[PDB]
Design a protein around this ligand. Structure first.
Ligand SMILES: [Mg+2]
Ligand SMILES: [Mg+2]
Ligand SMILES: [Mg+2]
Lengths: 76, 195, 149, 129, 188, 72
RNA sequence: GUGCUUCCUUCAGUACCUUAUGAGAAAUCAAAGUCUUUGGGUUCU
RNA sequence: UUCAAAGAAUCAUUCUUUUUAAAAUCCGGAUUUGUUACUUUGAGUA
């Protein structure tokens, strides 16, 4: 049944209805005290608000994301 | 039934071999960390039941041949033949058997029950030239060319094969009037098994 | 691929929902302002978009602002005379030519230079057909270097 | 590259039929293609089909009844006059008793018989058996 | 005193009632929002019934500008309030005009694609569900020469008493607007 | 006027000299499990058998009836 | 498993194997297939 | 880039009627709206 498919989001970016694999991230450093916002698969580095520190290490797909840290997905 | 499943487990039909065969994928539950492929087992049961039903649907039992060229399924198939009506072949299948009219050992059935379409492939092939349906107690890796029903099991492990055969026989008996339900069937596995 | 034998399909593909997502707080005006600032700072359209995506929380300027980013630049009046892609191509060509001048025996480079020239001429033609380029605009191997600025 | 979406779609359908599929994912939907599919459905050859709207050229997936022998485009959409039809149909489709030769006609797309009934011939899209 | 002014018609049965309700809400400041009916107006309404045991539901045709500015922003609150007040299910839509392509308006030169029929229909679909937001349109051509639009909405609405009923109402309203069958759903 | 047989899976319809193609017959149950007199029938064309999709087709057919329950 | 390594899926290369109610004059060919059920586009011969 | 919808006849199908927007025109009713290809009717041909 090509129409109502179930577990195949492990297809390529070219599914039945194309989605992106990327998503946005509510992110926080250990002790900057804020939602910083982020895009997974971000090319250019993002500097957090206060002390401008590397939050995302840039890379060939899905930014490495610095130190321990924590990220919620933005959802919706 | 859980009992059947338990029996299967005790034997080994849950393990299929390495090499998956894309058309068999659906029957396989998942692969293991080892490098083996575990068959879904409920599927094996249901399929087996279906096969049994089909067998029963044949009017007279004698014209439903069974086959295994393997040395250690041969015994099992003989037993099956004895218990139901069905011919066994056992061992050396002759290439003319279902086509060549004039041959001595001709005998053209209404169903063919192979144990393994890998090794007993000739028989399977023949089934095409005489419109014989073919059920197959096939492995994970096996080719399902010409086989109608594929019961997913394992063929490598002789004991497992024997068990499967026994189960099938039991099912057929149940379907027929001979051994009523609720009562377990008297004869054992080990009886079917090679040595 | 237009010129190689390359046949890859690596691509951005946007999400089904094209009315902006709930979590996006930025009002349009602010984002427009930001875009303008970026443009002023020397960034090109694509680059600007990338910056917006990464540094600020915003996926697509098209979902927040009805308009696409080039359009808004145009509206604000900070649009380049010479379109992004075309400009880039020209730059590349210039670079190639310099190399050739330096280093005469490079055959592969020359071949690639020809290809880039051809592509420019296509792109250039297309722009002429619209009204982004003026009709009086050939691309010249002599001038080229001065053009980019 | 693509040129005639419709042709490609028809080819895909044919392939599916040959294999004996059931479902088949016609990959760029087109108004024309949709119309063609509808026509086919009307004359029984195809089942349901769920034109899925992306936010682009849509995909159709189409439900097959194991009934089509072939379906096809005839590229160069030759203008075809009403008198010129008969010869064309003789050339193409396997019997006068069946098969359908689909024209785009200023009264929408319709089969050769329909065209005849109307009066207008037009440009010839394709056919099935 | 006002009330007739909040609508843009000659008062008729239900529009007037709706206006009154709005005024009351403005006066009272129910639930959370206040002075939001100062901003709102309406053009017209239509009561429609469904294939039910009972229930009638309401289109509220809103001038487009107003919809764009205020109603879009605060829709959930408004609709819920209306439901609480008048047990009839309500939907806001923008009265947006459709134009034939080949036709020549005094305005424009070339119709904008905003005003095209298809686009308008899409927009009204978007409008009518508004607690939720569409996941995927998908148009089943039945073999009978019918077309069914099988729309599926996101989560969110799954936490409500009115789900299936609401969906049915939406479908009905769509039918009324655009003589189109439709079916609605959600994911498990 | 011999009207030929339609493969119950793919509807391809199968001629005299096909062989290969098979009319598999499934016997019914009556409450106990005992063999009911009746028999539900599927013809399967040669092409599907050759492919190996035959088993899948059979499964689908069963699902369409009530005979077995998993589809795939 | 010990940042790398493997395994899964997937892209783009790139070969090979079996299989063709697919093709072919055959040799063979996952393209040489979807071709008297002949028309996706196009250049050359 | 206006998709569609509903009613009557016939042996699931065929042929017919009606309306679903916007602008100009006419005494709430009634009636015009890109160019060419293509196609249909004609006209005119010893
Ligand atoms: Mg080229
Ligand atoms: Mg490509
Ligand atoms: Mg040819």
């Amino acid at each position: 049944n090509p129409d109502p498919v179930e577990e195949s989001k492990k297809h390529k970016l070219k599914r039945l209805i194309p989605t992106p694999n990327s998503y946005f991230m509510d992110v926080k450093c250990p002790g900057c005290l804020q939602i910083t916002t982020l895009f997974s698969h971000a090319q250019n580095v993002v500097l957090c608000g206060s002390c401008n520190i590397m939050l995302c290490q840039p890379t060939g797909g899905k930014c490495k994301l610095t130190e321990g840290c924590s990220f919620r997905k933005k959802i919706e | 039934k859980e009992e059947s499943i338990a029996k299967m487990l005790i034997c080994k039909v849950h393990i299929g071999t390495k090499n998956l065969e894309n058309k068999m994928k659906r029957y396989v539950y998942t692969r293991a960390k080892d490098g083996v492929h575990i068959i879904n087992l409920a599927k094996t049961y249901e399929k087996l039941q279906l096969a049994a039903r089909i067998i029963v649907a044949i009017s007279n039992p004698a014209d439903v041949v069974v086959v295994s060229a393997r040395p250690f399924g041969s015994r099992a198939v003989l037993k099956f033949a004895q218990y139901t009506g069905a011919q066994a072949i056992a061992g050396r299948w002759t290439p003319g058997m279902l086509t060549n009219q004039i041959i001595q050992k001709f005998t053209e059935p209404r169903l063919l029950i192979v144990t393994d379409p890998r090794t007993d492939a000739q028989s399977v092939k023949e089934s095409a030239y005489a419109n014989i349906p073919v059920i197959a107690l096939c492995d994970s890796d096996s080719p399902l060319e010409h086989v109608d029903i594929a019961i997913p099991c394992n063929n490598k492990g002789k004991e497992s094969i024997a068990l499967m055969y026994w189960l099938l026989a039991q099912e057929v008996l149940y379907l027929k009037g001979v051994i009523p339900r609720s009562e377990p069937w008297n004869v054992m596995v080990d009886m079917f098994l090679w040595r | 691929r237009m010129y190689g034998k390359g046949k890859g399909i690596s691509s951005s593909t946007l999400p089904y929902k094209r009315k902006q997502p709930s979590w996006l707080k930025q009002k349009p005006s602010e984002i427009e302002d930001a875009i303008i600032k970026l443009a002023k700072k020397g960034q090109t359209p694509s680059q600007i978009g990338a910056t917006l995506r990464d540094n600020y929380g915003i996926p697509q300027v098209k979902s927040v602002t009805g308009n696409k980013i080039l359009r808004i630049l145009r509206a604000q009046g900070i649009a380049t005379t010479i379109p992004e892609d075309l400009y880039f191509l020209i730059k590349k060509a210039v670079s190639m030519r310099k190399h050739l001048e330096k280093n005469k025996k490079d055959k592969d480079c020359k071949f690639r230079l020809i290809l880039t020239e051809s592509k420019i001429h296509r792109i250039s033609r297309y722009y002429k057909r619209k009204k982004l380029l003026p009709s009086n605009w050939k691309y010249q191997s002599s001038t080229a270097s001065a053009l980019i600025a | 590259v693509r040129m005639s979406v419709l042709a490609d779609c028809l080819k895909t359908i044919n392939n599916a039929e040959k294999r004996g599929r059931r479902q088949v994912l016609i990959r760029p939907s087109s108004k024309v293609v949709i119309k063609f599919l509808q026509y086919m459905q009307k004359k029984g050859y195809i089942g349901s089909f769920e034109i899925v709207d992306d936010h682009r050229s849509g995909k159709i997936v189409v439900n097959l009844l194991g009934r089509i022998n072939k379906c096809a485009v005839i590229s160069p959409r030759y203008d075809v006059k009403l008198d010129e039809i008969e010869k064309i149909i003789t050339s193409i489709l396997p019997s006068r008793l069946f098969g359908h030769l689909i024209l785009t006609t200023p009264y929408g797309i319709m089969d050769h018989e329909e065209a005849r009934r109307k009066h207008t011939g037009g440009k010839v899209l394709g056919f099935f058996f | 005193a006002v009330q007739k002014r909040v609508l843009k018609s000659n008062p008729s049965d239900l529009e007037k009632e709706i206006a009154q309700c709005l005024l009351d809400i403005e006066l009272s400041s129910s639930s959370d929002i206040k002075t939001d009916a100062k901003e709102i107006k309406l053009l017209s309404c239509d009561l429609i019934e469904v294939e039910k045991l009972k229930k009638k539901t309401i289109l509220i045709y809103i001038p487009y500008k107003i919809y764009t500015t205020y109603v879009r922003k605060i829709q959930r609150k408004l609709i819920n309030e209306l439901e609480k007040k008048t047990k009839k299910y309500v939907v806001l839509v923008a009265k947006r005009t459709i134009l034939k392509g080949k036709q020549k308006n005094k305005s424009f030169k070339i119709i904008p694609r905003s005003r095209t029929l298809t686009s308008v229909y899409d927009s009204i679909l978007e409008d009518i569900v508004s607690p939720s937001e569409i996941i995927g349109k998908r148009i089943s051509m039945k073999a009978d020469g019918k077309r069914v639009f099988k729309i599926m909405l996101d989560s969110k609405e799954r936490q409500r008493d009115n789900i299936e009923e609401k969906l049915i109402s939406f479908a009905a309203v769509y039918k009324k607007i655009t003589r189109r069958d439709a079916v609605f759903s959600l994911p498990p | 006027i011999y009207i030929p047989r339609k493969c119950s899976a793919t509807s391809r319809l199968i001629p005299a000299k096909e062989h290969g193609a098979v009319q598999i017959n499934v016997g019914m149950v009556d409450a106990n499990g005992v063999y009911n007199g009746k028999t539900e029938t599927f013809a399967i064309s040669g092409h599907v058998r050759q492919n190996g999709e035959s088993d899948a087709c059979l499964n689908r057919l069963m699902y369409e009836k009530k005979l077995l329950s998993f589809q795939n």
